[PDB]
Amino acid sequence: IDLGRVIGELIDHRKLIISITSVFTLFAILYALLATPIYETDALIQIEQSAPETALLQSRMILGKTIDDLNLQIQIEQKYFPVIGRGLARLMGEKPGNIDITRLYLPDSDDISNNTPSIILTVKDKENYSINSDGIQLNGVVGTLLNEKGISLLVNEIDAKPGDQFVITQLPRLKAISDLLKSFSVADLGKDTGMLTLTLTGDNPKRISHILDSISQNYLAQNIARQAAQDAKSLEFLNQQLPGRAVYLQLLNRQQELNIAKSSAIGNVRIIDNAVTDPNPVRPKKTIIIVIGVVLGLIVSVVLVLFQVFLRRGIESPEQLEEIGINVYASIPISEWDTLLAVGNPADLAVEAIRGLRTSLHFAMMEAKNNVLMISGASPSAGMTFISSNLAATIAITGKKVLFIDADLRKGYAHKMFGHKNDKGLSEFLSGQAAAEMIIDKVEGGGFDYIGRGQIPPNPAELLMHPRFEQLLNWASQNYDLIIIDTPPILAVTDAAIIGRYAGTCLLVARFEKNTVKEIDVSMKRFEQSGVVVKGCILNGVVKKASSYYRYG
Amino acid sequence: IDLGRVIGELIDHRKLIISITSVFTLFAILYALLATPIYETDALIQIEQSAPETALLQSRMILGKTIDDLNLQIQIEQKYFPVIGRGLARLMGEKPGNIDITRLYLPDSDDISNNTPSIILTVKDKENYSINSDGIQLNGVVGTLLNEKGISLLVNEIDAKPGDQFVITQLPRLKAISDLLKSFSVADLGKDTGMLTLTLTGDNPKRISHILDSISQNYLAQNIARQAAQDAKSLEFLNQQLPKVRAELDSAEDKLNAYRKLNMEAKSVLDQIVNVDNQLNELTFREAEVSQLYTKEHPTYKALMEKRQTLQEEKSKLNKRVSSMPSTQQEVLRLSRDVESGRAVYLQLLNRQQELNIAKSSAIGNVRIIDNAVTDPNPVRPKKTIIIVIGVVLGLIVSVVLVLFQVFLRRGIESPEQLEEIGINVYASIPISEWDTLLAVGNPADLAVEAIRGLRTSLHFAMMEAKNNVLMISGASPSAGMTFISSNLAATIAITGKKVLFIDADLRKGYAHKMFGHKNDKGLSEFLSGQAAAEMIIDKVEGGGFDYIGRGQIPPNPAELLMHPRFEQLLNWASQNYDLIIIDTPPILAVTDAAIIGRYAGTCLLVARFEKNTVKEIDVSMKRFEQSGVVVKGCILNGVVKKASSYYRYG
């Protein structure tokens, strides 16, 4: 988990980390390149406070008048069936479609849920067109308004590209106020200065400048009217109250004074510069989301690689076994590769490591009480038979006479690998229906005498206790130089602990990353409880990244 | 990780550190001497608050007037094909080129992406020149304006150096405002005082002083428009003029609708005439103010009449072009001219009424300018000695982060103490020799040979009372130098006067016979196979003076051969007919041959390259030897660099 270790798995898992980081950066790039650009237009408004104005501008009375002025409740969208069709259309350089509806009156379904009657325009040419509401396509031409089925549409200056689809939505006036208010914004930048920076954000650049200009003009006219409104109320009641002729002339003087005061009311507010749009979009923010795509890829890569590191529990190195006190006698590398590897490809690394195991056994197996070696896998799929068969081959070619007993009376398949006469295996001997001679075979390849399990018996453990097994071992240990026995796992059955009573040396075989240290420890303890002393372990299937063996020659 | 050998390996990698810090400082030197200098000019403006003015000056109204005043939307640069041509041209002292365009009209491509049409001026002489837009080079002279292909250009007082290239960009008004505003800056420095320090930063010195003066004088003229506007008839003139202009606007759009209810040159000349008419209007109403604010002999007013005589020439040429094309186009062109000319005048008048009203509600009185803008001769950017020191520390920090990274990169042995911590008797530290014959007989006084003699003495002490006189030397890896050490050691022991036999039991890829001169037939493998006799395989290295046994042919079963009892017989015979027997074996991390021969060796040694083989390889090799019943006596470090070896010449 240390830094050196960390860069270790990172380069080891470089494919994974760079793949996921690249795919997230690819997603970030496509989103940055497909998200519709959103422009921002500004205006400068001058007064002589500004705290009421920043809320009076955002009032529905101001915005709603622009809505009714620019017909903004008539929404227009070029249709793209994909969620990204518009983006790619812009990417291809295709000029976006747009029309002008000066007057829309839908059938006004205006239901509680679908209060937005949505209609689609099918552009036939630059003059005529067809509109489908729910399938009923009404053909119409710019100029003449279509007034049928309660649908009054006056669309003019339709775009060029025919066959396109335009979604029309007569969303309610309140909605057309609320969205605009969401995009609209105001600020002061002086905290007392008359300066107001109206800012509007939208996709259509030419449209938003016009919208903000309309807002500014509506606010200007509103301020002109409002200051005049007080004088207008006074004037209205004077007009209502005109009947005392000297008082009448005084009232006439007041009447003319209020006429001039109301008419000449000039708003304090001032439009310093009309709205213009910044050509550079402010959203989507390029180079700010792509880097977030990068760092998101890296952080998720780290959190998943660490999770996978804390996911596996298998043996990682012979040092883990040796910490518990288990003499790892070998670390057989996993070979890429029906005959024995030791005779098929005698120069393969997994065979050089089995020769290395042969020497260490030959040293460790002297002083043993007899020449019987028991090899027990820690589990099925631990390759106990791979190791035992290849070891018997690599010892046979040496020149010793080797007998290879497959005492896995449950699911042994050595006979399925060496070529066999399935009759008269081992079980047929312990049952007493076969003699010691007709059961032994000759593997022509390995050059070692081989005994198969034979037919699966119903009582394996009960068979192995029969004293004929010890007779067989006593006879063989006299007629052979080495006896290898394959036994079932001790964590599954008890056959291993029955055979081990007669074995001079016992070894466990552990797949590299499948079997855990817990299984090896428990298996050796359970062998000890049965009076069988496990000499050591044989790590198997170690990946070539972790194995020290390499080709030489 | 401690100061002592921190300074140590920094003295070691001094070459690297000064190399890269110097590279970065040269990068900084070239950046500082190639970055275009930027000058800033400050002007001081006096009023009697000023918080509104800090944002009113930076409004598009005031800046937008200066842009239209100095034609700042016409951008010009000397063209340099490299990114640093301008800087190097300055470094040579070449006076930068500059020309003057009082009237530019590009073909107005103005696309969505390339909204800035670009042309290049090729300077032919001090008088004439040629301009290529996209290949069509139009030859022109100062004075006369070039009005061809919808392109109107009036350039005058062009620089001297001929053959140069001037890129011209008619960037839009908004861009020409935004860049200026980015460069422009205002402050107050009193938080209430009437002092407004204006600052403008740019490259061309005389450029920015004029721009700042124009800004200041526009603001002054606006606040004088205060004092003159209230009684001015212009207010009522605009009040009455707007309705009639909007009336003809309405009439013109009605005419368009009536005639509506695409020849390229038609649009080109239409846009050109409209631009000309807008400029003619704005210049008339501009003359309206320069006439009483300034005098006729004042050069600014002369500039107004000159640029309009240019514009009237341009309109004359445009009308000449209009007359020549078909009436089907002339009708539409006149109808569109009336229309968009009406909108242009209408927009102007709206503006006109607007800032004329700005005179009214401005409560400022006198807006005296204290001192006109002058540019500081010293450039403020690029900052000298403030990127250079950053170049220094950047090189230094990248040096430390790279050197420490390389420190934590290598994992090999670094000193015999690393092995002796594990408990390995390092018998020697053979230093690397600069140097086909044996080094022990080629260059007998080389340091590596003296260290090998030292190994000879240490062995001769440690090799006695071993069970026999066979020595097995096993490399920790291929390319650990096993055969170098073994061969030279055998030579150094043979010259002493002992009979030495050198068995190359590296049956897999042994090559000693390729180095001693050999009869390749009947090596060692041919003996284990039983097809050769014990005496027929032994040789004589004439140089070293020791008997040599080569591997012979590579057999298919090495480890199976080495177990044959003939190997036992051979060693038993030789150890009786020789004083010392050296055996070369393959690594034990790769094959099991070493653990087969170590069955019979009195002494076994590992050879480890200095920085290649790690401590783990030696530890694993010794433990795997022990598993096989072979006790490794110790190690022999090899190829240690002369910086870390204690050996030195003597004599």
Side-chain angles (χ1 to χ4, degrees), chain A residues 48-85:
Chain A
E48 191 275 330
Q49 300 179 330
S50 76
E53 311 320 295
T54 179
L56 177 59
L57 274 161
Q58 313 184 30
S59 81
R60 291 188 307 274
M61 152 189 174
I62 285 282
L63 309 185
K65 189 188 299 188
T66 48
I67 298 304
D68 295 331
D69 289 331
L70 292 175
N71 290 318
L72 291 203
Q73 80 282 26
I74 304 170
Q75 187 169 32
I76 178 63
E77 293 183 354
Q78 183 70 277
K79 175 58 185 179
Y80 308 84
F81 64 93
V83 70
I84 62 170

Tab-separated table of all heavy atoms in Angstrom, chain A residues 48-85:
chain	number	residue	atom	x	y	z
A	48	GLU	N	-30.017	57.985	-9.611
A	48	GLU	CA	-29.312	58.817	-8.644
A	48	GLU	C	-29.261	58.126	-7.285
A	48	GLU	O	-30.264	58.054	-6.577
A	48	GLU	CB	-29.974	60.190	-8.515
A	48	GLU	CG	-29.142	61.202	-7.738
A	48	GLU	CD	-29.341	61.105	-6.238
A	48	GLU	OE1	-30.447	60.721	-5.807
A	48	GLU	OE2	-28.387	61.407	-5.491
A	49	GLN	N	-29.549	54.723	-3.878
A	49	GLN	CA	-30.543	53.750	-3.440
A	49	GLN	C	-30.407	52.438	-4.205
A	49	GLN	O	-29.630	51.563	-3.819
A	49	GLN	CB	-31.954	54.313	-3.612
A	49	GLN	CG	-32.218	55.577	-2.815
A	49	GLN	CD	-33.613	56.120	-3.039
A	49	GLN	OE1	-34.194	55.948	-4.111
A	49	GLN	NE2	-34.163	56.777	-2.025
A	50	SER	N	-31.204	52.304	-5.268
A	50	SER	CA	-31.157	51.176	-6.195
A	50	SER	C	-31.623	49.879	-5.546
A	50	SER	O	-31.758	48.854	-6.220
A	50	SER	CB	-29.745	50.994	-6.756
A	50	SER	OG	-28.895	50.388	-5.797
A	51	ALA	N	-31.885	49.914	-4.255
A	51	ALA	CA	-32.340	48.728	-3.549
A	51	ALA	C	-33.792	48.408	-3.895
A	51	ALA	O	-34.149	47.228	-3.977
A	51	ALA	CB	-32.153	48.906	-2.043
A	52	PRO	N	-34.671	49.400	-4.079
A	52	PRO	CA	-35.993	49.060	-4.624
A	52	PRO	C	-35.943	48.628	-6.073
A	52	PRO	O	-36.700	47.737	-6.475
A	52	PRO	CB	-36.790	50.360	-4.450
A	52	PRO	CG	-36.105	51.073	-3.364
A	52	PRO	CD	-34.655	50.776	-3.556
A	53	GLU	N	-35.065	49.233	-6.874
A	53	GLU	CA	-35.069	48.952	-8.305
A	53	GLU	C	-34.662	47.516	-8.587
A	53	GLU	O	-35.231	46.868	-9.471
A	53	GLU	CB	-34.150	49.924	-9.035
A	53	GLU	CG	-34.379	51.371	-8.661
A	53	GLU	CD	-35.845	51.705	-8.507
A	53	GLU	OE1	-36.579	51.649	-9.513
A	53	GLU	OE2	-36.267	52.021	-7.377
A	54	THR	N	-33.691	46.993	-7.839
A	54	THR	CA	-33.235	45.633	-8.089
A	54	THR	C	-34.328	44.605	-7.865
A	54	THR	O	-34.187	43.469	-8.327
A	54	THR	CB	-32.037	45.291	-7.210
A	54	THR	OG1	-31.630	43.943	-7.469
A	54	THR	CG2	-32.396	45.416	-5.751
A	55	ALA	N	-35.403	44.966	-7.171
A	55	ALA	CA	-36.554	44.094	-7.053
A	55	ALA	C	-37.728	44.536	-7.906
A	55	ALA	O	-38.541	43.692	-8.290
A	55	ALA	CB	-37.007	43.996	-5.593
A	56	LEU	N	-37.834	45.824	-8.219
A	56	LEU	CA	-38.902	46.270	-9.097
A	56	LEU	C	-38.688	45.793	-10.523
A	56	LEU	O	-39.659	45.487	-11.220
A	56	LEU	CB	-39.013	47.790	-9.059
A	56	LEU	CG	-40.062	48.368	-10.002
A	56	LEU	CD1	-41.423	47.803	-9.663
A	56	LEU	CD2	-40.079	49.883	-9.938
A	57	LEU	N	-37.435	45.719	-10.972
A	57	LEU	CA	-37.161	45.179	-12.300
A	57	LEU	C	-37.591	43.725	-12.397
A	57	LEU	O	-38.210	43.314	-13.382
A	57	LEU	CB	-35.679	45.320	-12.633
A	57	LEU	CG	-35.287	46.661	-13.240
A	57	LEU	CD1	-33.804	46.879	-13.112
A	57	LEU	CD2	-35.698	46.699	-14.688
A	58	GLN	N	-37.286	42.934	-11.377
A	58	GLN	CA	-37.636	41.525	-11.390
A	58	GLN	C	-39.091	41.274	-11.051
A	58	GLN	O	-39.474	40.120	-10.850
A	58	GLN	CB	-36.745	40.751	-10.422
A	58	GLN	CG	-35.279	41.076	-10.530
A	58	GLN	CD	-34.443	40.211	-9.616
A	58	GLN	OE1	-34.799	39.073	-9.330
A	58	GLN	NE2	-33.332	40.752	-9.141
A	59	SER	N	-39.913	42.312	-10.977
A	59	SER	CA	-41.326	42.118	-10.709
A	59	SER	C	-42.010	41.536	-11.932
A	59	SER	O	-41.583	41.753	-13.066
A	59	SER	CB	-41.995	43.437	-10.344
A	59	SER	OG	-42.293	44.175	-11.517
A	60	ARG	N	-43.091	40.797	-11.697
A	60	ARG	CA	-43.832	40.275	-12.833
A	60	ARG	C	-44.477	41.374	-13.659
A	60	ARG	O	-44.799	41.136	-14.823
A	60	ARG	CB	-44.900	39.293	-12.372
A	60	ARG	CG	-44.341	38.006	-11.821
A	60	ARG	CD	-45.454	37.023	-11.575
A	60	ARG	NE	-46.497	37.606	-10.746
A	60	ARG	CZ	-46.477	37.613	-9.421
A	60	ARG	NH1	-45.469	37.058	-8.769
A	60	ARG	NH2	-47.474	38.169	-8.751
A	61	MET	N	-44.664	42.565	-13.100
A	61	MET	CA	-45.260	43.638	-13.882
A	61	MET	C	-44.309	44.121	-14.967
A	61	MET	O	-44.740	44.415	-16.087
A	61	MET	CB	-45.679	44.785	-12.966
A	61	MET	CG	-45.671	46.142	-13.612
A	61	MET	SD	-45.919	47.445	-12.398
A	61	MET	CE	-45.673	48.882	-13.426
A	62	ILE	N	-43.016	44.201	-14.665
A	62	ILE	CA	-42.041	44.576	-15.681
A	62	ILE	C	-41.893	43.471	-16.716
A	62	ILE	O	-42.124	43.680	-17.911
A	62	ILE	CB	-40.688	44.912	-15.033
A	62	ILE	CG1	-40.739	46.280	-14.361
A	62	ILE	CG2	-39.589	44.886	-16.066
A	62	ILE	CD1	-40.619	47.433	-15.333
A	63	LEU	N	-41.520	42.274	-16.267
A	63	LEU	CA	-41.213	41.197	-17.198
A	63	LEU	C	-42.428	40.812	-18.027
A	63	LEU	O	-42.310	40.571	-19.233
A	63	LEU	CB	-40.681	39.989	-16.434
A	63	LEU	CG	-39.552	40.318	-15.469
A	63	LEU	CD1	-38.997	39.060	-14.856
A	63	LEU	CD2	-38.470	41.061	-16.195
A	64	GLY	N	-43.601	40.745	-17.403
A	64	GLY	CA	-44.788	40.349	-18.124
A	64	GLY	C	-45.137	41.273	-19.261
A	64	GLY	O	-45.742	40.833	-20.243
A	65	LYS	N	-44.771	42.545	-19.161
A	65	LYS	CA	-45.024	43.429	-20.284
A	65	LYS	C	-44.106	43.112	-21.454
A	65	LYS	O	-44.549	43.129	-22.602
A	65	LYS	CB	-44.868	44.888	-19.868
A	65	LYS	CG	-45.327	45.867	-20.928
A	65	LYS	CD	-44.975	47.287	-20.542
A	65	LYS	CE	-45.648	47.677	-19.239
A	65	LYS	NZ	-45.466	49.121	-18.935
A	66	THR	N	-42.839	42.792	-21.185
A	66	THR	CA	-41.960	42.328	-22.254
A	66	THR	C	-42.469	41.027	-22.850
A	66	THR	O	-42.339	40.795	-24.056
A	66	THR	CB	-40.539	42.141	-21.739
A	66	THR	OG1	-40.572	41.401	-20.516
A	66	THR	CG2	-39.891	43.470	-21.502
A	67	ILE	N	-43.031	40.156	-22.015
A	67	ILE	CA	-43.588	38.906	-22.521
A	67	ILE	C	-44.673	39.194	-23.543
A	67	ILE	O	-44.698	38.617	-24.635
A	67	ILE	CB	-44.124	38.047	-21.366
A	67	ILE	CG1	-42.988	37.684	-20.423
A	67	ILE	CG2	-44.793	36.810	-21.907
A	67	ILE	CD1	-41.852	36.993	-21.117
A	68	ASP	N	-45.580	40.105	-23.207
A	68	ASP	CA	-46.652	40.449	-24.127
A	68	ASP	C	-46.152	41.271	-25.305
A	68	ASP	O	-46.818	41.309	-26.344
A	68	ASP	CB	-47.742	41.203	-23.375
A	68	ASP	CG	-48.415	40.345	-22.327
A	68	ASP	OD1	-48.469	39.113	-22.516
A	68	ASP	OD2	-48.878	40.896	-21.308
A	69	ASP	N	-45.003	41.925	-25.167
A	69	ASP	CA	-44.445	42.726	-26.248
A	69	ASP	C	-43.745	41.871	-27.296
A	69	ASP	O	-43.930	42.081	-28.497
A	69	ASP	CB	-43.469	43.760	-25.683
A	69	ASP	CG	-44.170	44.866	-24.923
A	69	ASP	OD1	-45.335	45.164	-25.255
A	69	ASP	OD2	-43.560	45.433	-23.990
A	70	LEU	N	-42.939	40.909	-26.863
A	70	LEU	CA	-42.164	40.085	-27.773
A	70	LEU	C	-42.794	38.729	-28.035
A	70	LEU	O	-42.186	37.904	-28.723
A	70	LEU	CB	-40.750	39.898	-27.230
A	70	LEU	CG	-39.935	41.184	-27.231
A	70	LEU	CD1	-38.591	40.964	-26.566
A	70	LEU	CD2	-39.765	41.683	-28.648
A	71	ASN	N	-43.990	38.478	-27.508
A	71	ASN	CA	-44.685	37.209	-27.703
A	71	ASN	C	-43.810	36.038	-27.266
A	71	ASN	O	-43.653	35.046	-27.977
A	71	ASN	CB	-45.130	37.048	-29.155
A	71	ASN	CG	-46.242	37.996	-29.522
A	71	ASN	OD1	-47.173	38.208	-28.747
A	71	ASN	ND2	-46.154	38.578	-30.710
A	72	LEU	N	-43.234	36.165	-26.077
A	72	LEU	CA	-42.295	35.171	-25.581
A	72	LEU	C	-42.971	33.930	-25.028
A	72	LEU	O	-42.282	32.946	-24.748
A	72	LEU	CB	-41.407	35.789	-24.508
A	72	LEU	CG	-40.434	36.833	-25.038
A	72	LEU	CD1	-39.277	36.957	-24.085
A	72	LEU	CD2	-39.946	36.448	-26.425
A	73	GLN	N	-44.286	33.942	-24.863
A	73	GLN	CA	-44.982	32.720	-24.496
A	73	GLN	C	-45.141	31.780	-25.677
A	73	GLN	O	-45.643	30.666	-25.503
A	73	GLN	CB	-46.348	33.053	-23.892
A	73	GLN	CG	-47.423	33.369	-24.905
A	73	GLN	CD	-47.302	34.769	-25.463
A	73	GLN	OE1	-46.219	35.351	-25.489
A	73	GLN	NE2	-48.421	35.321	-25.912
A	74	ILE	N	-44.734	32.204	-26.867
A	74	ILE	CA	-44.736	31.365	-28.056
A	74	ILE	C	-43.327	30.812	-28.201
A	74	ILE	O	-42.449	31.457	-28.776
A	74	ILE	CB	-45.165	32.145	-29.298
A	74	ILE	CG1	-46.533	32.783	-29.074
A	74	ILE	CG2	-45.190	31.236	-30.506
A	74	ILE	CD1	-46.918	33.764	-30.147
A	75	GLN	N	-43.106	29.613	-27.684
A	75	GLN	CA	-41.781	29.019	-27.692
A	75	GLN	C	-41.549	28.271	-28.994
A	75	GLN	O	-42.444	27.594	-29.506
A	75	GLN	CB	-41.611	28.076	-26.503
A	75	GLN	CG	-40.205	27.554	-26.335
A	75	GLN	CD	-40.017	26.842	-25.018
A	75	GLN	OE1	-40.945	26.231	-24.492
A	75	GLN	NE2	-38.811	26.923	-24.469
A	76	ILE	N	-40.341	28.403	-29.530
A	76	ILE	CA	-39.962	27.778	-30.791
A	76	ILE	C	-38.675	26.995	-30.589
A	76	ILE	O	-37.703	27.516	-30.033
A	76	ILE	CB	-39.802	28.821	-31.914
A	76	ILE	CG1	-39.349	28.144	-33.203
A	76	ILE	CG2	-38.857	29.935	-31.502
A	76	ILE	CD1	-40.329	27.159	-33.730
A	77	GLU	N	-38.672	25.734	-31.018
A	77	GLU	CA	-37.488	24.891	-30.916
A	77	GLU	C	-37.365	24.022	-32.156
A	77	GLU	O	-38.316	23.330	-32.530
A	77	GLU	CB	-37.534	24.003	-29.670
A	77	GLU	CG	-37.442	24.751	-28.359
A	77	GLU	CD	-37.420	23.820	-27.166
A	77	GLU	OE1	-37.597	22.600	-27.361
A	77	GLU	OE2	-37.224	24.307	-26.033
A	78	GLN	N	-36.193	24.058	-32.784
A	78	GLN	CA	-35.894	23.110	-33.846
A	78	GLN	C	-35.848	21.703	-33.273
A	78	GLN	O	-35.229	21.464	-32.233
A	78	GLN	CB	-34.562	23.458	-34.505
A	78	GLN	CG	-34.204	22.562	-35.670
A	78	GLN	CD	-35.092	22.791	-36.870
A	78	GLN	OE1	-36.195	22.255	-36.953
A	78	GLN	NE2	-34.614	23.596	-37.810
A	79	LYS	N	-36.506	20.768	-33.948
A	79	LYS	CA	-36.643	19.416	-33.430
A	79	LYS	C	-35.413	18.588	-33.772
A	79	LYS	O	-34.927	18.616	-34.907
A	79	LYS	CB	-37.895	18.742	-33.986
A	79	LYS	CG	-38.050	17.287	-33.582
A	79	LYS	CD	-38.067	17.128	-32.073
A	79	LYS	CE	-38.100	15.664	-31.673
A	79	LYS	NZ	-38.095	15.491	-30.194
A	80	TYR	N	-34.913	17.862	-32.778
A	80	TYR	CA	-33.867	16.867	-32.969
A	80	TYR	C	-34.249	15.655	-32.139
A	80	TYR	O	-34.345	15.753	-30.912
A	80	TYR	CB	-32.497	17.397	-32.543
A	80	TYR	CG	-32.132	18.722	-33.158
A	80	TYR	CD1	-32.570	19.913	-32.596
A	80	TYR	CD2	-31.338	18.787	-34.292
A	80	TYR	CE1	-32.237	21.127	-33.150
A	80	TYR	CE2	-30.996	19.998	-34.852
A	80	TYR	CZ	-31.448	21.165	-34.276
A	80	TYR	OH	-31.112	22.378	-34.831
A	81	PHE	N	-34.474	14.522	-32.802
A	81	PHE	CA	-34.876	13.323	-32.071
A	81	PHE	C	-33.884	12.900	-30.988
A	81	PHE	O	-34.346	12.489	-29.910
A	81	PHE	CB	-35.171	12.179	-33.055
A	81	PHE	CG	-33.988	11.724	-33.854
A	81	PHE	CD1	-33.202	10.672	-33.413
A	81	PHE	CD2	-33.690	12.315	-35.070
A	81	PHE	CE1	-32.119	10.243	-34.152
A	81	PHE	CE2	-32.608	11.890	-35.813
A	81	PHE	CZ	-31.822	10.851	-35.354
A	82	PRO	N	-32.563	12.969	-31.167
A	82	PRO	CA	-31.674	12.612	-30.063
A	82	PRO	C	-31.566	13.763	-29.074
A	82	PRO	O	-31.900	14.911	-29.368
A	82	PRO	CB	-30.325	12.346	-30.745
A	82	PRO	CG	-30.506	12.729	-32.190
A	82	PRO	CD	-31.769	13.506	-32.286
A	83	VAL	N	-31.083	13.431	-27.877
A	83	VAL	CA	-30.815	14.456	-26.879
A	83	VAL	C	-29.630	15.323	-27.269
A	83	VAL	O	-29.412	16.378	-26.665
A	83	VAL	CB	-30.587	13.795	-25.503
A	83	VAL	CG1	-29.269	13.038	-25.488
A	83	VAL	CG2	-30.664	14.820	-24.373
A	84	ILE	N	-28.870	14.913	-28.283
A	84	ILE	CA	-27.685	15.631	-28.724
A	84	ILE	C	-27.758	16.014	-30.197
A	84	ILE	O	-26.767	16.479	-30.759
A	84	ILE	CB	-26.409	14.817	-28.444
A	84	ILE	CG1	-26.447	13.506	-29.226
A	84	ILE	CG2	-26.265	14.553	-26.957
A	84	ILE	CD1	-25.145	12.747	-29.199
A	85	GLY	N	-28.913	15.820	-30.838
A	85	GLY	CA	-29.027	16.159	-32.246
A	85	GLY	C	-28.766	17.625	-32.527
A	85	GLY	O	-28.115	17.966	-33.518
